[PDB]
Design an enzyme around this catalytic site. Structure first.
Site, PDB file in Angstrom:
ATOM      1  N   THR C 170     -10.508  -2.535   9.261  1.00  0.00           N
ATOM      2  CA  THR C 170     -10.110  -3.565  10.233  1.00  0.00           C
ATOM      3  C   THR C 170     -11.182  -4.651  10.296  1.00  0.00           C
ATOM      4  O   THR C 170     -10.896  -5.803  10.632  1.00  0.00           O
ATOM      5  CB  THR C 170      -9.841  -2.985  11.645  1.00  0.00           C
ATOM      6  N   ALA C 171     -12.411  -4.265   9.959  1.00  0.00           N
ATOM      7  CA  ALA C 171     -13.524  -5.190   9.749  1.00  0.00           C
ATOM      8  C   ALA C 171     -13.114  -6.353   8.846  1.00  0.00           C
ATOM      9  O   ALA C 171     -13.722  -7.425   8.878  1.00  0.00           O
ATOM     10  CB  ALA C 171     -14.694  -4.444   9.141  1.00  0.00           C
ATOM     11  N   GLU C 194      -5.409   1.946  15.615  1.00  0.00           N
ATOM     12  CA  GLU C 194      -6.725   2.587  15.592  1.00  0.00           C
ATOM     13  C   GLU C 194      -7.496   2.299  16.882  1.00  0.00           C
ATOM     14  O   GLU C 194      -7.523   3.125  17.797  1.00  0.00           O
ATOM     15  CB  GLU C 194      -7.524   2.115  14.369  1.00  0.00           C
ATOM     16  N   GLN C 336       2.424  -8.387  -5.720  1.00  0.00           N
ATOM     17  CA  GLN C 336       2.564  -9.437  -4.726  1.00  0.00           C
ATOM     18  C   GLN C 336       3.836 -10.208  -5.041  1.00  0.00           C
ATOM     19  O   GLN C 336       4.074 -10.578  -6.193  1.00  0.00           O
ATOM     20  CB  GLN C 336       1.342 -10.371  -4.713  1.00  0.00           C
TER      21      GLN C 336
END
Lengths: 358, 138, 358
Positions: C170-171, C194, C336
């Site tokens: 998440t950083a 989280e 992608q």
């Protein structure tokens, strides 16, 4: 309701007895009016002699049998049904599936009593009581060589290839279908289930262009393969081969999917994914043999295995209705429903994915 | 109940109850040529009422059309008539109609196969069927 | 009469099932006599063969149950009368349509009774009743070398990026949202699976602020740090920052309370926290596609379990679900629906939690 219909077709051929004399005998009669009719049919074609509607009807008037069936009213209604023709066999099997039963079933009634009647025996009462139960023509494979023995891949067949795990047969089943869409005309249906649409594009160019000793994965080759390439994908548009992988579509679905193209192009070949990933085989694999006969398409409905025949003929069919069955290790067509059953001398470079002869 | 002839002859009238190229190539296939007795009685106001130079639709074409030929004229149009007229609905109706008086000789030849019958002749009549069999195709 | 005239035009073609088998099934039929006719047909069409009438009058007795549909009295009709050959559709979509009403009506008394016998559920009761019906251009990314090959991150696609045990997951998510909140003004609701909402504050008090070593896990500040937060906790509400904190929530308490933020100011890119937390996945990784397209949201999910692409096909749907597959492996975007297979090279500041660009 077989018996009401079955005779109707037998009539106007004059050869709807070739498989029918094999299927039904003078015992194969649940009915009572029918049993002597066929014996009046069988007496005819023994010279023979000639074969038509009437050759039986005045034969019946002779040797003691005409009102037995209720006149000719039902003798007419032996004919009046078969709203079909493209079946083929088929059909008389319905009567044989009214038959086989009691040759394996009527043979178990005495026994059910051979204990209170035959009281009184025991061992010999086994030795016998169990015995009864049983009762270029010809489209080439791409080659200019495989063109003179049998020739084709003509117009309708069932083919199932079995060589060592994922080798050049993986290439060949499709390397049968290469010199047909681009180098002549006919658009050939090559569908897949294992090797996807995004898995059969870079390596046809490996198979075409003098380009593969590199390889082609990095994006850019050596100063020659771009000077020599316009062979691999330039005429792919004006050709007629395209790739699919509808995960693993069943034996009826592709069978019902090769109807978009049969109207559109005429449908030339059906190179299928091994008929083993498609959804014990004398059953499941008998839904792509007959699709070749009506669709009028060579159908490459395959397998995944040394090679030997009654070894792929192991758990299933293969030595039966299934047509030509070759054997890759040299193409060992030690079986081909084709006439000249024989091996062709071949080889492989493995350098530029191109195979050889001699 | 209703055999084939009560379920083929009606909505084709209701297909053309609307627009032109539908109604156009019909009488040329059905002069007629109309099977059922009064399935011709209405066909005097089916063709001879664009003959005049009409435009379209069963608005006025639901009952005009007289009196006793009305209790069907209304109940003709009601049902599934997908006006994207099937090119495979084509040869059918008019072959269904026109080879009925062609097939109608089979409620005849069977009956001279079975007339010389009881009176004692059978296996040359067991040749009439070979005649009978073949025109059952169409 | 929708049932009555789809099972008669068949004995004419001879084979015509492809739309009748994919646009219909036997379960659509009503009559305790019309329903079972249709697979008896499929059963027959499972060979097969080509198709006719007689195959019916024998295989239902072979399915032993021919004493439960017709006989020569009723079986004569179906092929005899029908003067149409392009039917099926038709009709069959009405056999679908007069069978679709009750894909929403049988559901009723299996959903609408629950208000007086269950509850005994409540939040649960308001969730499966929902189940029982269903059946630069540009918006930026944040990073310079991530807005590179994408330019979105757009209001109709699910976006996925994930790391391994201790790589800062998440950083990284912060900075696909930090920009799209504080600077690039769009409202984003961090429904963090989280982290909570009394813990998420620091990792971007530390980002564009450089106060994550002081340590800023506790306490007060210096004559060089007293106001490093006047624009770090001074820049933490002038942004799309209304965090959701709660643990393993289902998809329910997410969509409804987010949807409405549209008409007061706006909504942009929903960036969340690890997936295996939202519980469980085959429906859940399926319940974020409509979250992206109907609500029109560039949803940016995260996950935690070498790893590679099989490690999410062996473990998870994920692949076609989230179709712009990015990695925190340097970054892999092999898949992608925005480009092909490209690459970069990356490193960290490490202590302030600022992932930098090369």
């Amino acid at each position: 309701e077989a018996e009401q219909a079955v005779l109707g077709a037998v009539f106007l051929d004059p050869a709807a007895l070739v498989p029918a004399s094999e299927i039904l005998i003078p015992e194969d009669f649940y009915r009572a009016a029918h049993q002597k009719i066929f014996h009046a049919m069988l007496r005819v074609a023994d010279r023979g002699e000639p074969v038509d509607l009437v050759t039986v009807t005045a034969e019946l008037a002779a040797s003691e049998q005409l009102e037995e069936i209720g006149g000719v009213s039902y003798l007419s209604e032996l004919a009046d049904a078969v709203p079909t023709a493209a079946n083929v066999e088929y059909y008389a099997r319905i009567v044989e599936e009214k038959s086989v039963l009691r040759r394996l079933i009527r043979t178990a009634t005495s026994i059910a009593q051979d204990g209170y009647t035959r009281e009184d025996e025991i061992d010999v009462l086994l030795d016998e009581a169990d015995r009864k139960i049983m009762e270029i023509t010809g489209i080439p494979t791409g080659f200019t060589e495989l063109d003179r023995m049998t020739s084709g891949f003509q117009r309708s067949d069932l083919i199932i290839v079995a060589a060592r795990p994922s080798v050049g047969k993986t290439a060949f089943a499709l390397n049968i279908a290469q010199n047909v869409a681009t180098k002549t005309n006919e658009n050939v249906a090559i569908f897949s289930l294992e090797m996807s649409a995004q898995q059969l594009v870079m390596r046809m160019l490996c198979a075409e262009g003098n380009i593969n000793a590199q390889n082609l994965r990095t994006g850019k080759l050596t100063p020659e393969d771009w000077g020599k390439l316009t062979m691999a994908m330039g005429s792919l548009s004006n050709a007629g081969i395209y790739i699919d992988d509808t995960p693993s579509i069943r034996v009826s679905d592709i069978r019902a999917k090769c109807r978009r193209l049969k109207q559109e192009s005429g449908l030339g070949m059906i190179v299928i994914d091994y008929l083993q990933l498609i959804q014990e085989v004398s059953e499941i694999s008998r839904s792509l043999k007959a699709l070749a006969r009506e669709l009028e398409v060579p159908v490459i409905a395959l397998s995944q295995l040394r090679p030997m025949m009654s070894d792929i003929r192991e758990s299933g069919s293969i030595e039966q209705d299934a047509d030509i069955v070759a054997f890759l290790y040299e193409i060992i067509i030690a079986k081909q429903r084709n006439g000249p059953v024989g091996t062709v001398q071949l080889a492989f470079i493995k350098e530029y994915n191109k195979f050889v002869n001699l | 109940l209703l055999p084939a002839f009560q379920n083929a002859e009606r909505l084709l009238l209701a297909h053309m109850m609307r627009s032109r190229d539908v109604a156009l190539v019909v009488q040329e296939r059905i002069g007629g040529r109309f099977n059922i007795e009064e399935h011709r009685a209405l066909a005097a106001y089916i063709y001879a009422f664009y003959e005049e130079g009409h435009e379209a639709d069963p608005g006025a074409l639901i009952s005009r059309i007289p009196g006793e030929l009305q209790p069907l004229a209304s109940e003709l149009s009601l049902l599934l008539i997908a006006d994207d007229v099937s090119e495979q609905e084509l040869e059918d109706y008019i072959r269904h109609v026109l080879n009925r008086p062609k097939w109608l000789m089979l409620k005849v030849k069977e009956q001279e196969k079975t007339e010389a019958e009881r009176r004692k002749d059978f296996l040359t009549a067991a040749r009439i069927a070979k005649e009978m069999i073949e025109m059952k195709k169409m």
